[PDB]
């Protein structure tokens, strides 16, 4: 019936929406991984600046 | 977020449809039972009229 | 989290409640309808025997 096609329509709506939800999940997740690697190289930079600054000060 | 809202909306569409169907079925039961009981009363009056005719 | 679980469970409960209520109502509707049919069928014969009695 009209309820059947309405149900299939909201169904495929839920499907595409959860698909895009998991999709942006993955995208923002990759972005968070990149940002974590950024923080890690950042702490590497902190440590290297600290050691070279300390050498200079020595 | 994003998918969570859509899933909630689906769960709400199911809610509305199920609740509406339940209410409509309840109204149908009320109407049908009223029909049956009025028919039974008509049958009773016919029995009494038959009794008077027998007398 | 916390909110998603409780809301989803409550909404699914609402859907299930409405569905079972609708099924009970429709079952009672079908039974009342068949009993009403029986009442009609008996009432016709009651009318026929009444007509013979009156003749």
Curated annotation (Swiss-Prot), chain A:
Domain of life: Eukaryota
Function (record text): Troponin T is the tropomyosin-binding subunit of troponin, the thin filament regulatory complex which confers calcium-sensitivity to striated muscle actomyosin ATPase activity.
Family listed: Belongs to the troponin T family.
Protein name: Troponin T, cardiac muscle
Organism: Mus musculus
Gene: Tnnt2
Curated annotation (Swiss-Prot), chains B, C:
Cell compartment(s), UniProt: Cytoplasm, Cytoskeleton
Induction description: Induced in stimulated quiescent cells.
Chain positions covered by the region annotation Disordered: 1-38
Residue intervals passing through the bilayer: none
Residues the record lists as Phosphoserine modifications: 45
Modified residues (N-acetylmethionine): 1
Biased composition range(s): Basic and acidic residues: 12-38
Subunit structure of this chain's protein: Homodimer. Heterodimer of an alpha (TPM1, TPM3 or TPM4) and a beta (TPM2) chain. Interacts with HRG (via the HRR domain); the interaction contributes to the antiangiogenic properties of the histidine/proline-rich region (HRR) of HRG. Interacts (via N-terminus) with LMOD2 (via N-terminus) and TMOD1 (via N-terminus).
Domain notes for this protein: The molecule is in a coiled coil structure that is formed by 2 polypeptide chains. The sequence exhibits a prominent seven-residues periodicity.
Assigned protein family: Belongs to the tropomyosin family.
Known role: Binds to actin filaments in muscle and non-muscle cells. Plays a central role, in association with the troponin complex, in the calcium dependent regulation of vertebrate striated muscle contraction. Smooth muscle contraction is regulated by interaction with caldesmon. In non-muscle cells is implicated in stabilizing cytoskeleton actin filaments.
Other facts: The sequences of cardiac and skeletal muscles are identical.
Protein name: Tropomyosin alpha-1 chain
Organism annotation: Mus musculus
Encoding gene, per UniProt annotation: Tpm1
Positions spanned in the full protein: 1 to 55 of 284
């Amino acid at each position: 019936d009209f309820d059947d096609i309405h149900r299939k329509r909201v169904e495929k709506d839920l499907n595409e929406l959860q698909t895009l939800i998991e999709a942006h999940f993955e995208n923002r997740k990759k972005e968070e991984e990149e940002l974590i690697s950024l923080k890690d190289r950042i702490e590497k930079r902190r440590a290297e600046r600290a050691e070279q600054q300390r050498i200079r000060n020595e | 977020m994003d998918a969570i809202k859509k899933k909630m909306q689906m769960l709400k569409l199911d809610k509305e449809n199920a609740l509406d169907r339940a209410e409509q079925a309840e109204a149908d039961k009320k109407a049908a039972e009223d029909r049956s009981k009025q028919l039974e009363d008509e049958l009773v009056s016919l029995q009494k009229k038959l009794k008077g005719t027998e007398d």
